[PDB]
A paper describes a structure:
In the nucleus of the infected cell, influenza polymerase (FluPol) uses the viral genomic RNA (vRNA) as template to perform synthesis of either capped and polyadenylated viral mRNA (transcription), or unmodified anti-genomic copies (complementary or cRNA), which then serve as the template for vRNA synthesis (replication). ANP32 is required for both vRNA to cRNA and cRNA to vRNA replication. ANP32 comprises a folded, N-terminal leucine-rich repeat (LRR) domain followed by a Glu-, Asp-rich intrinsically disordered region known as the low complexity acidic region (LCAR). First, it stabilises the formation of the replication complex, an asymmetric FluPol dimer comprising a replicase, which is part of a parental RNP and synthesises the genome copy and an encapsidase, a newly synthesised apo-FluPol, which binds the 5’ end of the nascent RNA replicate to nucleate formation of a progeny RNP.
We confirmed these observations by structure determination of a monomeric form of the FluPolB encapsidase bound to nucleotides 1-12 of the cRNA 5’ hook, which can serve as a model for the vRNA replication product-bound encapsidase. The PA peptides 357-372 and 504-513, containing aromatics residues PA/Y361, W364 and PA/H506 are refolded in the apo-form compared to their configuration in the 5’ hook-bound form of FluPolB, where PA/H506 stacks on nucleotide 11 of the 5’ hook. This suggests that for FluPolB, symmetrical dimer formation and 5’ hook binding might be mutually exclusive. Biochemically and biophysically, this is found to be the case, since FluPolB bound to the vRNA 5’ hook is soluble and monomeric at 150 mM NaCl and, furthermore, does not bind hANP32A. In the apo-FluPolB encapsidase, the PB2 lid domain is disordered (as in FluPolA(E)), but interestingly, is observed in its normal position in the 5’ cRNA hook bound form of the encapsidase, due to subtle displacements of domains. The PB2-N(E) lid is observed when FluPol(E) is bound to the 5’ cRNA hook. The replication product was manually extended from the top of the duplex through a channel into the 5’ end hook binding site of the encapsidase, modelled using the cRNA 5’ hook-bound FluPolB encapsidase structure.
Numbering used by the authors:
A (entry chain B): 1 to 185, 205 to 641, 654 to 668
B (entry chain C): 44 to 488, 493 to 742
C (entry chain A): 1 to 61, 72 to 715
């Protein structure tokens, strides 16, 4: 007899057991070496979908600019970024008609939020491309460095505290003939650059291979932007989020229970609205080259139309971000490694010296890549990337565009209606008609409409089936029963601060993963068991009666023998594990307090214990946690 | 990597930052060859580094510092733990649950404050001298300030911890979480256990130290009595025996039941079983009826349910009026053949009236209720017997309320001023459930003797059933007082540790009788109720093998006089279950017997376990950490013979450790041995022995 | 302060202000400050419109007032009604929010409640707005500024002044005036002028066909693009089509047919440690978890015969393996582990240097030197080889899912269960562990995790030293006896791991009982000697030493430390099924799921094939199989498996749709098939998954009839 795991699906629906097909126990793929190859591939692909557009030379930076919008309509099924402005405006106007006053209300809301916003908000972001050193650094560090640099050049807008003066200083910096900044060469130094170089650096992008991405055989590159545009992208995203919140078909921003509720409600609404005797079909789609095909100029037009009835200054403020993105420049990374096997020698060619050697010495793939990149290359090692949205960062605005595309609902008064849900690069399109052939006709019309707006539905990865079952952002729906949001369950290991706050963090993460993400009771209890095992192994504080031997474990055993009331002991001191689903949120020390005897309880709760020492407001709370300032709140060396 | 960063700190001589002064030097430089602190001449920081095991030394021999007022400092956590402790747990239901994202104030607060106002008040509480310029929130919030001054006075804890806890109890911490019908602040802290994505759990946080301690204790006691009785055959005798041999920490349960006219159903059932006075009223679960007018007849016939199944039911036909009540909310019900004529209720907690109305619906046997069933209705009971159809519908619709509300249909509410409708969520509206109306003129709410039958059902003098064994509410809770019981049959309620302690105490106390009966050589000494209770914690798969091994070892012990009290006591409890020998006909063999719960829950057959240990030097029996003396039943020859002849079946000692014969032999080969062959075994580290198989 | 807010303002005002805040999304508790202001604003905008009404002809004093409030109501409704009035009355619509509208002058009112001087605040509001609205500024210092003469008479002005009379002092007397924030602060930033350089950037950032940004703005603001979508679609080429195609069982051809081609070499064994062929030397212990070196020393002492072997028979040699060096390294390992020294370090000798690959990395030189040189060229990347199905993977799956008389898991304890939820959780864990713990896969996973933990510790702490790391495990049989299992020994090379992907070489010598010559294709990577024989079941079974050189990085070791997560993936999975059968029944189905009951029979799952016939196993068997599948996902996980799973999920969903008779359609089936197939290169699990997918697809096709 030969076992066959897939035979399980014979007796159980695939959706019910979809978790079996997710290999999340394996080591996620990781990229080795340079990311320049993938960045060049992204640049080439972005320029390929738009080469038929208008090509010119920028008069501010001297880069090569490719503009596909208002270009010739596509004639094949390949990805097309030749979006038409008129159609985008029509879609936005229709969405306005379906949502009267929504655009201006959202613009006002975002504008007032931007008034009240302060510069410190910029510190809430993730890694950002600091230009003073040209590297990815924490948002706070980049903000501090840029503020100091602006101080050196008589730009003291950030002093006012508001985000408006900071962004005003940002734009005015582009006007300075020369800029002085603090660099690291390691020691601190002052360095001066010219206006064009500063403009290029501000518009520049850092590129790196995405690591630990699941479900993708080949790696792909991702982009981090500078600190200059963070305010403008923030306000644009706030505006787009305000619009999305009021859009029924927007699969954002809430996640979890509201996600399943939205899926089910959309499905039910769609069934109910079906003409009698007709049919409803659902298309699970995936957008190929979603980032590449979208054009920043289309987003500029979107912002201009959204702020139709808003003050001129706010219109300019919204419009800045698309302008900078449309002129973005991409850094190509670390370069390429050339090796002679006979001599066992290797040498790294950085991006500026990419063409310093004849292309014959490169492999075929890199040879073709560089040959196609030549025109868009710059002497300093960066590439012009006027089209495309490599960094993303317009998830809300892109979602707005997708929803607007979904809002047409009909073409030429044909006998079919279509609606659905859109979230970033994923979507589900429901179509009702009299027969499946008409539904496919409507889906073809939707595909053409999406082509028209710069969105390319992927024919290889999308599919259609009678309404009732589908997939959306890893959420599988089948006759009401939504399977789950398949997410990488994390390592319930040692959080890594101290003895007590460690346990607090562990139990809090278990509770949150239970309450926000999908995890049932038995899974959570096994999670608690695994975390306690890892905790005891890491701190070598196994149970007092546990015959494991060790340096500290010897004194732990001595305590166990000495102890009279063993029920009230912390696992850090070899005590029994008491945590469960009920008492997940309560700190262990308070749980056991009633049980612990004074003989050891007094020592644990020593006011002037020699371990914790001087404390800080961050120390006890820093995510936040609950704990007791006992003997298990010590710090590092 | 943060996680890895400290797995190597322990390898360091001193990874922690020691303080300076007396407490720095309280821990010695070294202790039993383990370093704790050091005298390192730092450059300019005067710093001192302390080890990791030093915390253990502080816990063991460290100075016993003053802990006064600690509970007051952490009042928030203590209140949280008391809310959890004083809570009561209801049923757990499986089905669709709809949760909505909301900003729901994760934790509670003594008084909600803005962060700056909270910081000001905190600065006042801890350091009035250093508060600086007087402020205004100091003026208005004088009451809380004064209370906290009165509370945190005299504590030696570091002021930073006091300030942090004050901020915790003052500064709000709001987050977006999913909630389904539980929005109170007390509920969010347990929201993780409240309900998942496919199930719901009923949670009732405790309030204050409620005065109804005795009633709350006897209710749960009687509920457990019923739960234990129902599963066992002939619940009558077992239930009455249990209720007669139960004491609420000072007095028998019967005296309390007579004294207080409390309880809902379980107390009534127990009172009838014991022959006491109970109130006269019909029950159908949480809802009680009191007929006022009309009469009906019971006819058995088949009906069709919405899900499409046929099952016989005894329906009641005829006009009837009932003074229906549920929990606290009162009302009146009109019932007829498959119709709900009219229903009147009062104002109360939303859940109380919801339970009331749904119970009326299910009891009414309205055709709409038959058609309001979608899922399977095969619910089971604790005993594993299929529930009666009416109780099956009751449970199904209690677990599923929206379906019946949707199916029933609505109508217009009356125009009377005091009469108004209610929606699915008990919201006043013109559209009201047909025959259901709210009212403001509250209706006002004496003992007799009732007989009992085998199935714990109350039947009146004429024979009508008044209380059913299925009406017991499944609201599990913890008694406020330390109740105690004497019967072995119910020892399974306590933890496996407690059960083992109780059974070992029982066997020890009457050891003389057990030995006297065992010397005779019958089998009725293995059927004691204590061993019946003990068999619960033994795993079923290995229970037969354990019992076979125990019987074989005891028989070998008796045949050849190597009688040892310790082993007899240890292995007697396992002899109940029927023997399960191997295909060869020889009993299984073991090194340690594992019980339910795993881990510590194991009894060692050779040396001793945490649940059972013996010290022959002092003749002390340590059961589960409790020490007893076995003087008067231990013989000197018993002290001589240590353990060699009572560990293995059909084997006896013949010599001492012989390395030439070989190393210690494992069970896998011991079972395969042939008569007339000598092997070597190990009792525990440093005490090897030699044994030989005997036919 | 909220308790004070409630005093001066009724519940409706407070809730309207809180809702207006809700359209701002900053914690209302954080700063009631502006809340105060807005409610005050709202309040005045209501008092100006309390008793002032108009008649059907214009009488100043029926169902029409002379004013209409905008503030407080939802922003979308406010703006829609404002636009409605603007278009109805044919008046310029303000570009800012309107606070109040008049019915006599037909103009939009703006009101501002400031702290100090009013005239300067009035001029600042004019700067913000200009003349689009009439401004009514008030200030607690009895100050006022109204831009219209007959907007309101003295009665309303006096009434509002009186209403602010309390708040000018009432806050101070109860000590609240100090922390009162102004009203201009929330609108400090209004001025925003673009520089010349940014203006040019915006100018060149216009869509094609427009001269500059001004033209684009005029076009977007003025032209109505009705019919653009239909026109463009009409003039678009028909070639741009999705190409619908109804799916049928015939279209679903087997995936990756090349795996049936016998020319390609059968996929070889590549797992880090032996999984089913492992032979663990067992030593009986009753406690202390002694040191790994001490444990290995004792285990080898028990089997001195195998340990003392010095004349091996070379059975298999790998293509590029030095048999003498491997044997010398093994002897060095055994001697070092068997010595009295606590340290387990191996001297960096010639054979050790070769096995660890000492001094193999290419030297780095300056970029200029490489540029000048001609023979230096970028190496062609190595592509994974194509391989065909191998039976050893099927044997691994079959064997590791079979129950064994051992227990490797030793999970810790938890607090007693109280509530029903933890009761059901404990029941589920009881059943799942009772099933899993007695399976070979669990022991293999424990060996993997323990070895990876030890390897990571040694690599991080002994970067510059060669170390011998015994492959050890702790096991407990059903009878309570405890054994320590020694499966083999590992030599750790230099581990100067700086990057996450830095590779450290490990030489594994693992005991086994399988003769490699039985399945030659399974062992092209393994150098196998015959080290001895053992008496087990009445037969002298040969014991071989599989010697191999492998490599791992930090990421793989860290994930190996966390291999226990496999449990979770299995547990959750089965729990879901249990939950599902609870939904159908409404009560806990765990007992019925596992052991059944009088009502519901025990559940069964189609498990595999026997003589070409489908066979069914119990719930526990399916649990164990999915657990071994998770363990396999771990041991054979890499980019190929991720890609294959991601691409085949779509085909699985299409098959499910076909089963449900949901008439699924496809748009480009060949593309999906190519995406699936390009991931099947050399990963044994991926190849076997393709084979099983083909077989199960065939069975589903047979059933569909």
């Amino acid at each position: 007899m030969n076992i066959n795991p897939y035979f399980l699906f014979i007796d159980v629906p695939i959706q019910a057991a979809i978790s079996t097909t997710f290999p999340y126990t394996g080591v996620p793929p990781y990229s080795h070496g340079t990311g320049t190859g993938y960045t060049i591939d992204t640049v080439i692909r972005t320029h390929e979908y738009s080469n038929k557009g208008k090509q010119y030379i920028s008069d501010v930076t001297g880069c090569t600019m490719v503009d596909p919008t208002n270009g010739p309509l596509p004639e094949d099924n390949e990805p097309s970024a030749y979006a038409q402005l008129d159609c985008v405006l029509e879609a936005l106007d229709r969405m306005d008609e379906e949502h009267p006053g929504l655009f201006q209300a959202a613009s006002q809301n975002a504008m007032e939020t931007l008034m009240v916003t302060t510069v410190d908000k910029l510190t809430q972001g993730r890694q950002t491309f600091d230009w003073t050193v040209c590297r990815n650094q924490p948002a706070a560090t980049a903000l501090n460095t840029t503020i100091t640099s602006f101080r050196l050049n008589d730009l003291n807008g950030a002093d006012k505290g508001g985000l408006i003066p900071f962004c005003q200083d940002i734009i005015d910096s582009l006007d300075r003939p020369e800029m002085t900044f603090f660099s690291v060469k390691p020691m601190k130094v002052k360095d001066k650059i010219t206006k064009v170089e500063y403009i290029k650096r501000a518009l520049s992008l850092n590129t790196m291979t995405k690591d630990a991405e699941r479900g993708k055989l080949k790696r792909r590159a991702i982009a981090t932007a500078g600190i200059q545009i963070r305010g403008f992208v923030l306000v644009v995203e706030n505006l787009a989020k305000n619009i999305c919140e009021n859009l029924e078909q927007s699969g954002l921003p809430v996640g979890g229970n509201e996600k399943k509720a939205k899926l089910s409600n959309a499905v039910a609404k769609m069934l109910s609205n079906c003409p009698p005797g007709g049919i409803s079909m659902t298309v699970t789609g995936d957008n190929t080259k979603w980032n590449e095909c979208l054009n920043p100029r289309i987003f500029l037009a979107m912002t201009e139309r959204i702020t139709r009835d808003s003050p001129i200054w706010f219109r300019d403020f919204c419009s800045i971000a698309p302008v900078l993105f449309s002129n973005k420049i991409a850094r190509l990374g670390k370069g390429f490694m050339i090796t002679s096997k006979t001599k066992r020698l290797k040498a790294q060619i950085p991006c500026p010296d990419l063409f310093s050697i004849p292309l014959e010495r490169y492999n075929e793939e890199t040879r073709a890549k560089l040959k196609k990149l030549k025109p868009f290359f710059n002497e300093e090692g960066t590439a012009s990337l006027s089209p495309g949205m490599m960094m993303g960062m317009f998830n809300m605005l892109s979602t707005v565009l997708g929803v607007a595309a979904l809002g047409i609902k009909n073409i030429g008064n044909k006998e079919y209606l279509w609606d659905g849900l859109q979230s970033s690069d994923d979507f589900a399109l429901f179509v009702n008609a009299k027969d499946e052939e008409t539904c496919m006709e409507g889906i073809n019309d939707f595909y053409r409409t999406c082509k028209l707006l710069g969105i390319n539905m992927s024919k290889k990865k999308s599919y259609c089936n009678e309404t009732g079952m589908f997939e959306f952002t890893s959420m599988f729906y089948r006759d009401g029963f939504v399977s789950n949001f398949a997410m990488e369950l994390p390592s319930f290991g040692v959080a890594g601060v101290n003895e007590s706050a460690d346990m607090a963090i562990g139990m809090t993460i278990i509770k949150n993963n239970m309450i926000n993400n999908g995890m049932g009771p038995a899974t959570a209890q096994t999670a608690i068991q695994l975390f306690i095992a890892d905790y005891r192994y890491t701190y070598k504080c196994h149970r007092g009666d546990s015959k494991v031997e060790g340096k500290r474990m010897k004194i732990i055993k001595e305590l166990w023998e000495n102890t009279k009331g063993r029920d009230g002991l912390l696992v850090a001191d070899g005590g029994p594990n008491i945590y469960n689903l009920r008492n997940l949120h309560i700190p262990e020390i308070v749980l056991k307090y009633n049980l612990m005897d004074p003989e050891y309880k007094g020592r644990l709760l020593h006011p002037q214990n020699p371990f914790v020492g001087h404390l800080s407001i961050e120390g006890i709370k820093e995510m936040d946690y609950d704990a007791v300032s006992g003997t298990h709140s010590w710090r590092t060396k | 990597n943060p996680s890895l960063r400290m797995k190597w700190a322990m390898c360091s001589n001193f990874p922690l930052a020691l303080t300076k002064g007396d407490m720095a030097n309280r821990i010695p430089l070294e202790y039993k060859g383990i370093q704790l602190k050091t005298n390192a001449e730092d450059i300019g920081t005067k710093g001192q580094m302390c080890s990791i095991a030093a915390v253990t030394w502080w816990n063991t021999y460290g100075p016993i510092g003053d802990t006064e007022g600690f509970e007051r400092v952490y009042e928030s956590f203590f209140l949280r733990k008391m809310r959890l402790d004083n809570a009561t747990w209801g049923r757990i239901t499986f089905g669709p649950v709809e949760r909505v994202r909301k900003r729901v104030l994760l934790n509670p607060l003594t008084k909600e404050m803005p962060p700056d106002e909270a910081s000001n008040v905190i600065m006042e509480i801890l350091f009035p001298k250093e508060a600086g310029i007087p402020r205004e929130s100091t003026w208005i919030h004088r009451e809380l300030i004064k209370e906290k001054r009165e509370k945190l006075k005299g504590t030696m804890i570091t002021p930073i911890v006091l300030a942090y806890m004050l901020e915790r109890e003052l500064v709000a911490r709001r987050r977006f979480l999913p909630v389904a019908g539980a929005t109170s602040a007390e509920f969010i802290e347990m929201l993780h256990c409240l309900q998942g994505e496919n199930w719901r759990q009923i949670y009732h946080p405790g309030g204050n130290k409620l005065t109804e301690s005795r009633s709350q204790s006897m209710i749960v006691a009687c509920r457990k009595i019923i739960r234990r009785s129902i599963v066992a055959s002939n619940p009558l005798e077992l239930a009455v025996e249990i209720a007669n041999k139960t004491v609420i920490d000072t007095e028998p349960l019967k005296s309390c039941l007579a004294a207080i006219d409390g309880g809902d159903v379980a107390c009534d059932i127990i009172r009838a079983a014991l022959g006491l006075k109970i109130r006269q009223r019909q029950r159908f679960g949480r809802l009680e009826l009191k007929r006022i007018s009309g009469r009906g007849f019971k006819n058995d016939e088949e009906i069709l349910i919405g899900n499409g199944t046929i099952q016989k039911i005894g329906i009641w036909d005829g006009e009837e009026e009932f003074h229906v009540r549920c929990g606290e909310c009162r009302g009146i019900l009109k019932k007829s053949k498959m119709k709900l004529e009219k229903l009147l209720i009062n104002s109360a907690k939303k859940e109380d009236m919801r339970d009331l109305i749904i119970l009326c619906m299910v009891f009414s046997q309205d055709t709409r209720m038959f058609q309001g069933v979608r899922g399977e209705i095969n619910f089971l009971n604790r005993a594993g017997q299929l529930l009666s159809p009416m109780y099956q519908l009751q449970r199904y619709f209690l677990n599923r309320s929206n379906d019946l509300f949707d199916q029933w249909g609505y109508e217009e509410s009356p125009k009377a001023s005091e009469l108004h409708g209610i929606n699915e969520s008990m919201n006043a509206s013109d559209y009201t459930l047909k025959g259901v109306v709210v009212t403001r003129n509250v209706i006002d709410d004496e003992t007799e003797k009732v007989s009992i039958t085998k199935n714990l059902s109350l039947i009146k003098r004429t024979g009508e059933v008044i209380m059913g064994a299925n009406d017991v509410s499944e609201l599990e809770s913890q008694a406020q007082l330390m109740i105690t019981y004497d019967t072995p049959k119910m020892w399974e309620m306590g933890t496996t540790k407690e059960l083992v302690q109780n059974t070992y105490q029982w066997v020890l106390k009457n050891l003389v009788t057990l030995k006297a009966q065992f010397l005779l050589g019958k089998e009725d000494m293995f059927q004691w109720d204590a061993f019946e209770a003990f068999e619960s914690i033994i795993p079923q798969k290995m229970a037969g093998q354990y019992s076979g091994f125990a019987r074989a070892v005891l028989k070998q012990m008796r045949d050849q006089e190597v009688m040892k009290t310790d082993q007899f006591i240890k292995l007697l409890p396992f002899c109940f279950s029927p023997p399960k020998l191997r295909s060869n006909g020889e009993p299984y063999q073991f090194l340690k017997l594992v019980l339910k719960g795993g881990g510590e829950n194991f009894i060692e057959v050779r040396k001793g376990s945490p649940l059972f240990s013996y010290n022959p030097q002092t003749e002390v029996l340590t059961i589960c950490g409790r020490m007893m003396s076995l003087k008067g039943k231990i013989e000197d020859e018993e002290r001589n013979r240590s353990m060699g002849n009572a560990v293995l079946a059909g084997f006896l000692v013949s010599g001492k450790y012989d390395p030439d014969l070989g190393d210690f032999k494992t069970i896998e080969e011991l079972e395969k041995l042939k008569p007339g062959e000598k092997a070597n075994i190990l009792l525990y580290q440093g005490k090897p022995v030699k044994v030989v198989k005997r036919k | 302060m909220d308790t004070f807010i409630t005093r001066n303002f009724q519940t409706t005002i407070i809730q309207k202000a809180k809702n207006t805040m809700a359209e701002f999304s900053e914690d209302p508790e954080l700063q009631p400050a502006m809340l105060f202001n807005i409610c005050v604003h709202l309040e005045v905008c209501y008092v100006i419109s309390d008793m002032n009404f108009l008649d059907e002809e214009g009488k100043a004093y029926n169902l029409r007032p002379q004013y209409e409030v905008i503030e407080g109501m939802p922003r979308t409704i406010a703006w829609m009604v404002q636009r409605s009035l603007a278009q109805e009355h044919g008046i310029e619509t303000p570009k800012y929010l309107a606070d109040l509208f008049d019915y006599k002058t037909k103009r939009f009112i703006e009101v501002g409640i400031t702290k100090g001087l009013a005239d300067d605040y009035f001029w600042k509001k004019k700067e913000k707005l200009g003349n689009s609205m009439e401004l009514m500024i008030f200030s607690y210092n009895q100050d006022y500024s109204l831009s219209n003469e007959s907007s309101l008479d003295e009665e309303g002005k006096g009434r509002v002044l009186s209403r602010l009379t309390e708040l000018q002092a009432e806050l101070s007397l109860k000590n609240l005036w100090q922390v009162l924030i102004g009203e201009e602060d929330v609108e400090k930033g209004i001025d925003f002028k673009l520089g010349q350089t940014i203006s040019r950037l915006r100018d060149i950032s216009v869509p094609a066909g427009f001269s500059n940004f001004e033209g684009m703005r005029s076009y977007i603001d003025n032209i109505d693009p009705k019919g653009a979508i239909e026109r463009n679609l009409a003039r678009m080429s028909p070639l741009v089509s999705v190409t619908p195609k109804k799916l049928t069982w015939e279209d679903l051809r087997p995936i990756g047919p090349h795996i049936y081609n016998h020319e390609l070499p059968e996929v070889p064994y590549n797992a880090f440690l032996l999984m089913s062929d492992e032979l663990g030397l067992a030593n009986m212990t009753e406690g202390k978890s002694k040191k790994p070196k001490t444990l290995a020393k004792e285990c080898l002492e028990k089997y001195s015969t195998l340990r003392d072997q010095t004349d091996p028979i070379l059975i298999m040699k790998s293509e590029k393996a030095n048999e003498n060096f491997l044997w010398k390294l093994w002897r060095d390992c055994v001697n070092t582990i068997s010595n009295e020294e606590m340290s387990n370090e191996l001297q960096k000798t010639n054979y050790a240097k070769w096995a660890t690959g000492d001094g193999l990395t290419y030297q780095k030189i300056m970029k200029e030197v490489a540029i000048d040189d001609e023979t230096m060229c970028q190496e062609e990347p190595k592509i994974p080889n194509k391989c065909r199905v191998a039976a050893w993977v099927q044997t691994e799956m079959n064997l590791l899912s079979t129950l064994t008389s051992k227990r490797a898991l030793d999970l810790p304890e938890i607090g007693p269960d109280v509530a029903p939820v933890e009761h059901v959780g404990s029941e589920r864990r009881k059943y799942f562990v009772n099933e899993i713990n007695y399976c070979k896969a669990s022991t293999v996973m424990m060996k993997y995790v323990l070895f990876h933990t030890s390897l990571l510790n040694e690599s991080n702490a002994s970067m510059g030293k060669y170390k011998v790391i015994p492959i050890t495990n702790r096991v407990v049989n059903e009878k309570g006896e405890s054994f320590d299992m020694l499966y083999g020994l590992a030599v750790k090379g230099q581990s100067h791991l700086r990057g996450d992907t830095d590779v450290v070489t490990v030489v594994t010598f693992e005991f086994s009982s399988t003769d490699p010559r039985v399945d030659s294709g399974k062992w092209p990577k393994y150098t196998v000697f015959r080290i001895g024989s053992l008496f087990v079941s009445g037969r002298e079974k040969s014991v071989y030493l599989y010697c191999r050189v492998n490599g791992t990085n930090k990421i793989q070791m860290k994930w190996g430390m966390e291999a226990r997560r496999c449990l979770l993936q299995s547990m959750q999975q089965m729990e879901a099924i249990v939950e599902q059968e609870s939904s159908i029944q409404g009560y806990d189905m765990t007992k019925a799921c596992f052991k059944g009951d009088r009502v519901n029979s025990p559940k069964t799952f189609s498990i595999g094939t026997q003589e070409g016939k489908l066979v069914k196993g119990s719930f526990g068997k399916a649990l164990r199989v999915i657990f071994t599948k998770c363990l396999m996902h771990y041991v054979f996980g890499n980019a190929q498996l991720e890609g294959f799973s991601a691409e085949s999920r779509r085909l699985l969903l299409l098959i499910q749709a076909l089963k449900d008779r949901k008439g699924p359609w496809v748009f480009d089936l060949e593309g999906m098939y190519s995406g699936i197939e390009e991931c099947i290169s050399n990963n044994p699990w991926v190849i076997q998954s393709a084979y099983w997918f083909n077989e199960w697809l065939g069975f589903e096709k047979e059933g569909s009839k």
